[PDB]
């Protein structure tokens, strides 16, 4: 039986177990930004909560997890949900899952019609990295407006949102700037996980549109990678499948990618 | 006086600190630490030394103005030039927001404005309130962010993406609280610290579920939030809009008084 989950505090043990089973650390924006906003549902076997999933506003699953002993029942359940058969979850179009979420992926594969790759998940290898070095500085409170103006002009995110997002990163000391003669040439993020994945750092960059192709992005990832290493964290990052320039920089910053976020549609 | 645009707010560290030191009471957190740092900033230069500044928001309204204290006469000349739209660099300014606690900036607005209206009331807490039943609020944890976001989105219409960041950050700062019943939020309370200038105060906010108005809840929330501030050694302040009669009533019942106002002035 399936119920809407009132309080996400009921899922504590099962979430930890879900993340533990991942082959690699999962993408922070997907699983710590979007997933928590999504509607959750608990799977209850005889009044004990033994699983959950969550479905976004567009009608896409983002997570699914049943306690490891319910194989044949797991298959039937997933097929039910994926085939619109739950009065209580309703119309589910599809799923987003990575190649690091084996069980969830497996069931997606069995019950989906088509797919596309959403993004690449990378991890850092020390051996894969004499590149020229830059210095970046920790963003201070007073620099907030300059970072917001920068990000807005270069990725088009909304200012009000960026003000809060970067406000928070500045408090966490996770935002960095590459400055040249008074202007920002890049913003870098070295983001820590508050839970489950506390031994990793998730990296992001924006390079000024006026200075693409100068190899800035790769120097930024190198810097952020070292800043992560000095805190004892291993670096990961991700990017969209059609973002060729990001993929280039990342690979030249010594990252490799054996993982993908895929978007499946149900039959 | 040369007016110059200012990119790095670092250039204004000292001038800003004097601006705030000069205030009669602590100023509103959302106005002065949320909005003002997002606004466009200009500096006032005597002979290539930076001796004052102002900031103009997106709508064309001044939010802050300050000249080193010894420029009384030039200050008036300056403000008038800027208010009658003759500043090449600053451009067309429509008006100003200013409180009754910023005496110098207010004076100049008074001198140069055509019309006005009140925007909000600023209150502070006199330890002459209330043996009265006190509610228990629970500090928000990460797990409850979405419930808070949904609660605020439904009750005040702010956007969810924005709320997710604003509330995520409050949760990390331990400034957000919830008043719960049967798994649902009856109200949300904020007890916010200031990182600089006003570190002896806590700035409070609340949202009462629209399904539970007129049941005394906001008063009780404010009372909790004041006590939580007091355990941190902080004095409580808050503000609300001039049309928010329910808020004003709860605030004044929670033992707060108001000698101050934020006013919106329109320029002649
Ligand atoms: Cl630094
Ligand atoms: Cl109570
Ligand atoms: Cl209760």
């Amino acid at each position: 039986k399936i119920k809407t989950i009132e309080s996400l505090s009921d899922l504590t043990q099962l979430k930890k177990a879900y993340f533990d089973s991942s082959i690699v650390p999962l993408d922070g924006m997907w699983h710590f930004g979007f997933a928590p906003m999504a509607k959750h549902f608990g799977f209850y076997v005889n009044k004990n909560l033994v699983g959950f999933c969550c479905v976004n506003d567009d009608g896409y699953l983002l997570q699914y997890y049943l306690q490891p002993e319910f194989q044949l029942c797991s298959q039937e359940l997933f097929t039910l949900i994926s085939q619109q058969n739950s009065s209580v979850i309703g119309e589910v179009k599809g799923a987003f899952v990575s190649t690091a979420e084996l069980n969830y992926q497996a069931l997606c594969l069995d019950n989906s019609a088509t797919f596309k790759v959403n993004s690449l998940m990378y991890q850092h290898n020390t051996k894969l990295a004499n590149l020229e070095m830059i210095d970046m500085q920790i963003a201070g409170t007073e620099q907030l407006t300059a970072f917001v103006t920068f990000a807005a002009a270069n990725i088009g995110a909304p200012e009000q949102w960026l003000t809060q997002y970067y406000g928070n990163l500045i408090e966490r000391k996770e935002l960095f700037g590459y400055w040249h003669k008074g202007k920002l040439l890049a913003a870098g993020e070295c983001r820590l996980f508050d839970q489950y994945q506390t031994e990793y750092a998730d990296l992001g960059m924006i390079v000024a549109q006026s200075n693409r192709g100068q190899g800035i992005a790769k120097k930024v990832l190198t810097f952020l990678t070292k800043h992560a290493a000095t805190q004892g964290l291993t670096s990961i990052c991700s990017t969209e499948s059609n973002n060729v320039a990001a993929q280039k920089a990342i690979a030249h910053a010594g990252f490799t990618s054996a993982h993908r976020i895929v978007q499946f549609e149900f039959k």
Side-chain angles (χ1 to χ4, degrees), chain A:
Chain A
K1 54 211 200 62
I2 312 185
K3 322 177 165 170
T4 295
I5 297 278
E6 264 255 57
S7 192
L8 267 51
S9 308
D10 297 339
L11 296 178
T12 293
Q13 170 185 202
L14 274 50
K15 285 258 178 189
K16 165 129 129 249
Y18 181 72
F19 292 110
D20 289 347
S21 70
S22 82
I23 301 313
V24 288
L26 301 179
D27 185 80
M29 184 201 299
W30 278 90
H31 291 272
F32 305 101
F34 304 148
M37 307 164 16
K39 190 165 183 188
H40 293 238
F41 303 90
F43 304 132
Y44 298 71
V45 167
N46 230 100
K47 297 213 217 257
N48 333 267
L49 172 58
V50 308
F52 75 94
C53 62
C54 65
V55 174
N56 78 3
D57 278 330
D58 297 318
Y60 290 83
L61 258 38
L62 299 186
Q63 308 174 332
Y64 171 99
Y65 176 84
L66 228 198
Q67 270 170 192
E69 85 298 351
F70 288 108
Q71 182 64 53
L72 236 191
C73 283
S74 197
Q75 253 153 284
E76 210 196 84
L77 177 48
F78 197 99
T79 285
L80 181 93
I81 284 163
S82 54
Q83 290 288 304
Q84 315 249 108
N85 273 46
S86 196
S87 30
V88 1
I89 296 172
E91 262 143 37
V92 180
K93 279 147 166 165
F96 292 95
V97 62
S98 79
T99 55
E101 292 147 275
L102 293 170
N103 279 117
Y104 174 28
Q105 183 189 46
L107 302 170
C108 291
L109 288 157
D110 296 348
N111 291 276
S112 292
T114 74
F115 79 93
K116 70 187 152 187
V117 181
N118 174 92
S119 40
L120 282 73
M121 288 147 64
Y122 295 85
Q123 213 141 118
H124 187 254
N125 216 48
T126 295
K127 320 198 285 171
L128 266 317
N130 217 125
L131 169 56
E132 325 211 340
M133 223 155 148
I134 59 168
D135 252 326
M136 308 182 73
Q137 285 76 232
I138 190 100
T141 299
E142 306 101 314
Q143 301 178 313
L144 180 53
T145 185
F147 280 87
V148 166
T149 292
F150 176 86
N154 286 291
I155 61 179
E159 299 207 326
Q160 223 55 232
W161 185 85
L162 254 1
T163 295
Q164 291 296 316
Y165 175 77
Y166 282 164
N168 185 60
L169 256 41
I170 287 175
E171 295 195 45
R172 291 160 65 80
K173 313 213 230 292
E174 288 179 348
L175 181 60
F176 292 83
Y178 175 39
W179 293 88
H180 184 275
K181 297 192 159 199
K183 93 171 195 132
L184 269 178
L185 294 192
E189 302 181 23
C190 187
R191 286 179 254 121
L192 278 59
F193 291 94
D194 282 354
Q195 257 178 130
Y196 311 123
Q197 292 182 181
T198 55
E199 54 288 286
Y200 299 97
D202 201 5
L203 306 189
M205 0 66 296
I206 304 167
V207 183
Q209 282 310 122
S210 61
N211 297 257
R212 311 303 302 274
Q214 301 172 183
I216 299 177
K218 70 190 186 176
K219 312 245 230 278
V220 171
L221 286 173
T222 304
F223 175 98
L224 298 163
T225 290
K226 294 180 186 149
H227 176 81
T230 77
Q231 282 174 272
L233 312 166
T234 312
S235 302
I236 63 183
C237 64
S238 80
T239 187
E240 314 85 35
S241 45
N242 74 331
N243 198 348
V244 177
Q247 294 176 34
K248 206 207 204 195
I250 286 167
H252 293 349
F255 289 81
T256 53
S257 188
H259 288 288
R260 302 275 185 291
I261 299 187
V262 183
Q263 180 185 332
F264 291 98
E265 318 295 337
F266 295 139
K267 326 210 193 167

